[PDB]
Design a protein around this nucleic acid. Sequence first.
DNA 1: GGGCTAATGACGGCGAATACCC
DNA 2: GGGTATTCGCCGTGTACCTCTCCTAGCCC
RNA 3: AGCGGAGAGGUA
Lengths: 1337, 79, 98
Amino acid sequence: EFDAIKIALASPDMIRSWSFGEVKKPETINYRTFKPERDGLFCARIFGPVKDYECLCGKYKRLKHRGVICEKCGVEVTQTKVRRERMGHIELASPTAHIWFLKSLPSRIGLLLDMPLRDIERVLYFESYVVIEGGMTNLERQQILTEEQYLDALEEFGDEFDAKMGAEAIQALLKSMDLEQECEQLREELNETNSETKRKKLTKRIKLLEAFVQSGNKPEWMILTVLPVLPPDLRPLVPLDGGRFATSDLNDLYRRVINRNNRLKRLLDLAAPDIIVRNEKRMLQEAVDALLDNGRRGRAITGSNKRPLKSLADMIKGKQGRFRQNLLGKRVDYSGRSVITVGPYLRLHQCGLPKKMALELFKPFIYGKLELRGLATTIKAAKKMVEREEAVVWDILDEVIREHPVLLNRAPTLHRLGIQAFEPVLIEGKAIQLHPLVCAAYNADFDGDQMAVHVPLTLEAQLEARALMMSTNNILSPANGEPIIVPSQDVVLGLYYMTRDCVNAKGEGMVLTGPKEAERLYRSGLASLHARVKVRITEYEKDANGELVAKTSLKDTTVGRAILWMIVPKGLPYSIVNQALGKKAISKMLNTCYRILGLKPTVIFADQIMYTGFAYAARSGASVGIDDMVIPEKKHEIISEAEAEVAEIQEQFQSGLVTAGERYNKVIDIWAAANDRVSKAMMDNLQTETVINRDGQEEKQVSFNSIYMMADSGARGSAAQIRQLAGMRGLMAKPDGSIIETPITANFREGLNVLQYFISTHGARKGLADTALKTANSGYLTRRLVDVAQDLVVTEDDCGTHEGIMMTPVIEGGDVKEPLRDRVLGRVTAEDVLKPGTADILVPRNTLLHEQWCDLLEENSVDAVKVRSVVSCDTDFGVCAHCYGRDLARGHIINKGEAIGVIAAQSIGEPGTQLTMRSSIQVKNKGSIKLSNVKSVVNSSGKLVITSRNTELKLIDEFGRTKESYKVPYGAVLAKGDGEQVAGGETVANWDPHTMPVITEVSGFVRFTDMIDGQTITRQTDELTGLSSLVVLDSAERTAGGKDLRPALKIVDAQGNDVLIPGTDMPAQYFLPGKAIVQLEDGVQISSGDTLARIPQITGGLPRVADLFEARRPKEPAILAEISGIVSFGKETKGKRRLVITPVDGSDPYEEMIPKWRQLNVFEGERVERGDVISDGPEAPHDILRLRGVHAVTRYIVNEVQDVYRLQGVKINDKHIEVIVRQMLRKATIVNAGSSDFLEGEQVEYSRVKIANRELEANGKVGATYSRDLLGITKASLATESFISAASFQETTRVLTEAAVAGKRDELRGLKENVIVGRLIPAGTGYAYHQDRMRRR
Amino acid sequence: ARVTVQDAVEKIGNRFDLVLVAARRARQMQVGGKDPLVPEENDKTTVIALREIEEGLINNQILDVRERQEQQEQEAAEL
Amino acid sequence: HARSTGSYSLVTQQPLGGKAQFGGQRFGEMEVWALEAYGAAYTLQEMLTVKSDDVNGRTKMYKNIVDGNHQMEPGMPESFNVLLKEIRSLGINIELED
DNA sequence: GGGCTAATGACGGCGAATACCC
DNA sequence: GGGTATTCGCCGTGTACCTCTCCTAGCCC
RNA sequence: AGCGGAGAGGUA
Ligand SMILES: [Mg+2]
Ligand SMILES: [Zn+2]
Ligand SMILES: [Zn+2]
């Protein structure tokens, strides 16, 4: 019906056009008769018919008189729904300022007038005056005066010069302001002001003006003269339980405004003195400002029971406004709620469903099919039949629910598997039966969880349900390629009991022709379930073109593995079922079944796993008992020596020979070692508990103790929990946050005593509090993430470019912790893979890297792979297909449309419920040593030391990839160097953390240049040796009288001449900073690699992830150098200690004040590149954007937050984080406009400016030079060209007002506003629809 | 019966236009007076529609042929 | 608890909340995002237009089910039009284009 | 009895509004 | 006057559901 | 057809 939405300020002409009458009287209801009044808030003659097609006087009770108004009380007879849209108005007596434009912070009126908000508050509250139409006065136009200054002006310029008060005066100012003259005068002052602050205020001023005149606005329109009133049905007046009416806050508000208005007009006729009507207008302004936005004035007014009433800003904002409560999430018919229970007999493409829920949900279907079969004439006969519950309509329902899928939902709907479709099978009972595998996707145990059902009505919705949301489709998470159909807990117990092997039981070593004789043995009770048997098996391999080759053999296996082998379909090798099959093994079993055989045998294979899993977990009978948990007998002695050791250290503290910190550290260490000794005792005495005779003497083997099988299966719990059952548990923390020196020496099988249980109670309560407040963060995180991606539809097939990022497997400093074939897997290459047969092309430049190509990358040891990423994808308004790669739930390239923004943000934010909340270099393995960006010298002894901080120590393997990586500090004593073979287990470096060495470069003499005892350096005799050394003071400790000197050391020869830097013609003098102690005294002929002086010396929870996507500037930012060239220092503590940067070729106007708490990296003789490190601390994201580029900052994000999730071990494939980063840096600014139309210091989105200069590329003219910005997620959300989505997100007032003075118009191009306006989403099927609709226009 | 829509995707590589082709076809079988082009099992219109997508005798192109050709029947009967 | 079609609320033509009032379930915001995560558009488009808000469209729907047609006619969410009259009931001119 | 009516126990954060310092 | 620097007011703070009560007083008639 | 706001407890 309609395209884009435009919004603007309200003309009073538009207000009167909207309205249908001036509401005049504050009484609404008669409440004696139930009619409302003549012209009250509920008005029949303004708003329309109370009842259906009747006048209020009751004249035209017939439909024939439709359209004509009456004369008795003048009510236009129409539908009663016409009382729903007809608005009203009020002619106010006084002009009245709107409160949003007054106090939006920044105020629109305030910077519109170049006037502080303090004074404008004073004007609107009648405690100052203001000049209008100055002329021949000593009084400026914006000059505000007090009452006594108004007396002085009343004497002095009390002639034809004018001055007023209130909103009439603000109406006069906005009435008399010219626009172009201040555009010229303030662009003129953007020329004339060198001041950055005036440049910023005046460019915000110039945006308000040049956007205001371009918009369809007028400045005096902000002062509301004619107040529009809401239609009455939207603000209804319901009866409560009795003859009273439940109050609306609206009708109280308008009741006050109409009281105060009518009393004001009566005060205008009677002409009271100015102070009374001053108070009356002041109470009117308080009334209207209360009605628009209550509470933005410093105290609200209360309606009843001492409670702040609900304005219209509270009809929009907040968790209970229309966007949160009635627009984005709507209550829906055709739905139901019930407790779930199991019902294991179902297949996974069906779920259980009770009968009475079905008969209540499917009533229109039953009605239609009763009309089809003619067993019912009318709607009331059919309705009485389904009220009657006849035995015919159960057959009708069994017809209509033959193939009718339903959409089940669970209430914390975190990631996209929360609604899945099923098919019902009707159930005697009252609870939903639900297939067990799906429980692991729903995060839904059966402790009392309640799931809701919805029903797709229309036919397209049924096809969307069965095609997409059917549970057979969703087998792989969008987070990772892992199966989400993992057999969770009983079925794996049935397998880990099934595929096990003991050495001596029934039927050892016999021979059987196949698995059918195995199951015939086990059902006979003639052979053991787990006793090792050679059988004959026959398997099939699809090495040919889908052709399954047969082979047979006589494997060594067990009986239960054969009975398992009858289920496994043809395409699998037998080694998938020849091991013990814990949880990981059955998981990768299903995954290989999907990668090899496709979808249908994988699904029905998983069903047969589940049914046989409960059959043999049932028949097995794995119980649990008090005899099953085994105390190690050696526990008591390790307790005894533990008490002996803390007895000895306690004795050492008795006379005071150890410190309290030493006692604390020593005691916690010996308890930790004791705890792990007990853990090895119980873990061995569980895992090899069984010793049985083999038909010979004996043998030990793995144990049939049930709690070990529940552990080693991986069904429930870990070695830490089963440690806590048998061995002693833990060192529980304290409420302070520290650890407690007396560990709980007893377990759960013995009793806890009292105080141990008290401390463990603290551990549990801190845990549960962390769960509640943790989720209280997590929902807000996923909330923001989907409200910043939100928009991002895979809309093209290729960008046709060759940028990208470089995937290397991460090496944190030890082992490789995420390998290459997980980060690379399933993404499209930037250019071809240059094999290290170098100039060999392993894969081409656009090929999707599935598992075969990744194996070919794996065999040829491919080091670094550049790859097309979404962050560098050159798609306009979207993401191309060949820059995204795999869906990760469909084993091919992404289809055009499935909006990876939302699946990204849910798949990122979902495991946040599972996060947490609150020397030298010793190499490991044997390979070659590679150094990165080295500037080094070999010392006097032959060890290598490095004069560059930024040199990185890599251990390359035997082949050529990197397998270790390390940081080598400034002046660090290496043991080896580049191209040198180190042994597996070598200390290959050294440095001192309590020394910043000032090491030499060549040899010669050392003169203490500008080192004067008392001014730069001070005399301190060393107390412990005797060879004293002069201490270089720092900046603030010396006085200013000798502070302007710089102490240095210049390498000089036997003549005093300049011994220069090797390669350049600069001497190697070192300007000494503070806390340097030159040990080597004057005139020492020095060597290489010796210290010229010694300069001595967090949270990764969910708020780490939050502040990463928020991108906060952290506490002590590691500052960087903006540009290359040599550097030096500047003025001593003018606030901070200044820097002096100097490039070689370019100019050097850039220098920057430096906080002197930072031990810098650079020196006066040290030259850097642009964006090089200057100090220590975290690496703040903005400067990483604007210096090192885009790829560095997205790489820093994905490795950072990938480390955060990676520590707790929950996999998120990186593309989701990458695409949220793509939404972060969508906005940009301008360096030079060129032939475009933008202001230079203006912010605009990168897509619109890239198509702006890209179409200025269509002419020969040069477009703009852009500069990208990095916003946080909560600010990049609000700074979006669609304002309506930003209204649906936070700070609704600021979004709407900036939209209003912006005059903003919204072509909508997105998702959430289309959920708002209620049309098809341009996401999937509706993306084909907007292909149609955008294709037509 | 119905378990997957795998092979329907194997003949229509979008998995979204599966829904529009299927909705167009099954809408042409529920409202319009046309028989199924496959033997049914007293199934619904949905599984009959996707089931006809399984045998590949319907995609978007054949539906263009029938809307155009039955459309020309609506031209030729107009005279 | 279940509900085919019962009473509708007053200020918004939407299903009521709860069980003692014979009301539907809240198809909340997060699973609107989850429908966005699938390609399901027509599912969603009947979730929050036909089955939820527009009174004309669900009369048409109720007639079409009892006749044997499965088709939706969207119209417009009533509640969005209520929001339009609310923002319009402040000092804000907000319209729709052609 | 009743018709009708005229507070103090958050916390983080973030951009304007003084403060003050040279 | 600029140039930080504090500070000072506003926005925010989990998802559905279930159960219950309790819903103006002043007041001069 | 006649169901809006507080406040309290609980459910996963
Ligand atoms: Mg639960
Ligand atoms: Zn009348
Ligand atoms: Zn691309």
